[PDB]
Structure formats: structure tokens, C-alpha cells
């Protein structure tokens, strides 16, 4: 029972690294992507700026 | 950590006698890993109050092994909270399980481990139960303060004892103390109505002889007696300063005797297990 117990919480706690990497990917991709609305014109008028 | 007190050459007629010292404590002055026997040493008996004043500035250590070359030891308390060791009773009283032990200088003298070879002698201090060393120290300081099986006092350092006592006693007098003093009659009349209250007050209580001689009027209200209260402050001062009164006079407890398998009590002159606190 104790050994089954270990195996199980093992297989319960640390792959939340796999889920956690899947999380961090989105958490990073979000904080650097501007909204399409503020970006579609910004490329159109590019070059003639300043 | 282990202290190594090196020994000079001694008489084989006396080295063996010193091998009979396996549970007696000694008073170093500094905690260097090595040391010498010539260092930890006190003269013969005299000025028990001087001695007990000496046993507070210098932390002690118990010896464990005596080989013809070195003599190990162990610093009594420097970082340890459960460091179990052994030390032998060398007092006149016995000691039962559980109770704490205290160290008091040797009474009446004449207990000096004389070493004619090294020309130096020691005085291994005795071990008493706490509540009894309390009585001993109290008696000695009371008799010393009297000087404005008993050794004669000195009148030189007894003033240090009188000063240390009278300072703590004087600082008990607060503006709330008189509020607690204004009920001595009201206390005595309660003492005589119940057996327990009457047993609490002793016979020579030195206040029962006041409750029938002097009268005091109601106590004058102190300054700004409408915000704060002085009774509670007085009593907190009292408890905080009495929880350590005996310590600054006698010696702090250092160890409590524990015994797992042996008989409950240890008679005098027998090794006893102990845990340090």
C-alpha cells in the first residue's frame, strides 16, 4: 500500500512540469503580442514615419 | 567539541586517586580546545559567597575520562539542549528523578583533592536539588546582610550581595504597590475565615505583626488615575523580576536528572545519568 501510494503521488506531482511548460508557453506568448487592431495600420504607414 | 586538559607527571600514589574523579565538574575560564591542569584550580575553602560569585562568570565543564596522559571533559552548556552525560552526586543530600540540579561551592571546606606532585589542588563543587540550594543561598545571604557548621563571613564582598539584593527589592516599590499594601487588614480578616488562607500566611510572616500595630488611611488617587491602572503594572513588574530573583543571587539550574531503567533515587556518592538543559 505504501509503495503504491508513493508511485501514485510521484505520478501526481512533478509533470505539472509538462503541463507547466504548456502553461508558461502561453503565459509568455501573451505578454508580448500586441492586439491586431493596433498593428494593422502601423505596418501600412511604415517608412513614411517621423 | 571536547576539552583536553593536559596533565603534568603526577605521583602514581595520587594519579590513581585522581582517576576516581569521573563525574565532578570544573570551572574553566575560556573554551579553547586545549588547556592545562595548572589553570583550572582554586585555593582551599573560604568566602563561600566569593566562590558562588565566581561560579557565574566562568562556565563549567564535566570530565569524562582520565588517562595517565590527558583528561577529556565536556563544556556543560554552550550550545547543547539535550546533551546527555553523567555526573556523580557529591553533596550531603540525595536526589530523586526529574528534579533539576544546581552547583553550589563546597561547604565547610576540607574537601580538597590535594596533588603534592603538581603542587596544585582542586575543589570540585557539590550538586544539590534546586529547591534546597535555594534555602542554602537564602540563608547565607540573609546572614551576610545581618553584618551591617558555619563559616565566618568577610564583610568585603558581602556588600555586593547586600547591594544586589536591596536593588531588586527597592525596585519593587511602585505607586501601585501601596494600593496593594492598603489591604493588609482586608487580607488578614480573610485569612482567618478559611483554612487555606490561614495556612498560606506563615507564622513569622513579618506582616501579620504589622496588621495589628499600624493603621493606614485610604490611598490617595495617583496622577491621571482615570486613564491607566497601576495594580496590573505593579504585578507584572513583580512577576517578571521575581522569576529570576534567585538566579542573580544563587546559581541557575543547569541540568535535570533523568533515569530510564535504574532505581528512582540515587544515593550520595553514586553516578547518575542526567540530561543538560
Amino acid at each position: 500500500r505504501a509503495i503504491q501510494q508513493l508511485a501514485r503521488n510521484v505520478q501526481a506531482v512533478l509533470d505539472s512540469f509538462e503541463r507547466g511548460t504548456a502553461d508558461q508557453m502561453l503565459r509568455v506568448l501573451m505578454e508580448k503580442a500586441p492586439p491586431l487592431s493596433l498593428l494593422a495600420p502601423f505596418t501600412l504607414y511604415e517608412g513614411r514615419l517621423a | 567539541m571536547e576539552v583536553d586538559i593536559a596533565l603534568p607527571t603526577l605521583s602514581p600514589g595520587d594519579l590513581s586517586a585522581l582517576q576516581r574523579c569521573e563525574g565532578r565538574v570544573v570551572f574553566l575560564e575560556t573554551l579553547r580546545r586545549h588547556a592545562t591542569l595548572r589553570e583550572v584550580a582554586l585555593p582551599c575553602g573560604g568566602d563561600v559567597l566569593a566562590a558562588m560569585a565566581a561560579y557565574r562568570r566562568r562556565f563549567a565543564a564535566v570530565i569524562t575520562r582520565v588517562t595517565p596522559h590527558r583528561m577529556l571533559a565536556t563544556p556543560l552548556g554552550v550550545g547543547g539542549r539535550g546533551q546527555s552525560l553523567v555526573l556523580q552526586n557529591t553533596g550531603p543530600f540525595d536526589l530523586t528523578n526529574g528534579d533539576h540540579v544546581c552547583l553550589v561551592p563546597p561547604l565547610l571546606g576540607d574537601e580538597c583533592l590535594r596533588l603534592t606532585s603538581a603542587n596544585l589542588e582542586l575543589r570540585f563543587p557539590m550538586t544539590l536539588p534546586l529547591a534546597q540550594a535555594r534555602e542554602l543561598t537564602a540563608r547565607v545571604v540573609a546572614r551576610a546582610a545581618e553584618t551591617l557548621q558555619l563559616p565566618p563571613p568577610h564583610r568585603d564582598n558581602a556588600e555586593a550581595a547586600t547591594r544586589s539584593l536591596v536593588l531588586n527589592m527597592i525596585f519593587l516599590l511602585n505607586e501601585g504597590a501601596v494600593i496593594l499594601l492598603s489591604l493588609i487588614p482586608n487580607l488578614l480578616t480573610l485569612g482567618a475565615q478559611d483554612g487555606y488562607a490561614n495556612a498560606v500566611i506563615q507564622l513569622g510572616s513579618a506582616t501579620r505583626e504589622l496588621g495589628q500595630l499600624v493603621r493606614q488611611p485610604p490611598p490617595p488617587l495617583p496622577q491621571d488615575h482615570a486613564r491607566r491602572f497601576c495594580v496590573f503594572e505593579a504585578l507584572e513588574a513583580w512577576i517578571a523580576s521575581a522569576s529570576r530573583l534567585g538566579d542573580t543571587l544563587g546559581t541557575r539550574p543547569v541540568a535535570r536528572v533523568c533515569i530510564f531503567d535504574g532505581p528512582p533515587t540515587v544515593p550520595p556518592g553514586e553516578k547518575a545519568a542526567v540530561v543538560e538543559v
Binding site: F17, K32, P35, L36, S37, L39 | -
Partner: protein
């Protein structure tokens, strides 16, 4: 984008600590990330409400 940003995984540490007869492991793995592309390389829509 096809490769938006680099990413560096570390070797897993295993911190110890005791707690009153009940013990508790503490896993740990350091990471790192830099956006490889120059210029913006990730859009955003806010489609619905």
C-alpha cells in the same frame, strides 16, 4: 510563428526539508527564454465578447 522564441530548460534540483515527522519534497527546475525574431512575431485578436 514557426519559431517564436528560444527556451532553455535546466536540470532538476531536489530540495530537502523536514517538517515534524511529516516530510515534504520541493522540486525545482530553472528556465529561460528570449524572443528570437526581430520585429513583432505574435498577433492577438480578441474575437468574441
Amino acid at each position: 510563428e514557426k519559431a517564436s522564441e528560444s527556451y532553455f530548460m535546466g536540470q532538476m534540483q531536489v530540495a530537502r526539508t523536514e517538517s515534524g515527522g511529516g516530510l515534504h519534497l520541493q522540486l525545482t527546475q530553472p528556465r529561460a527564454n528570449v524572443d528570437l525574431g526581430v520585429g513583432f512575431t505574435a498577433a492577438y485578436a480578441a474575437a468574441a465578447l
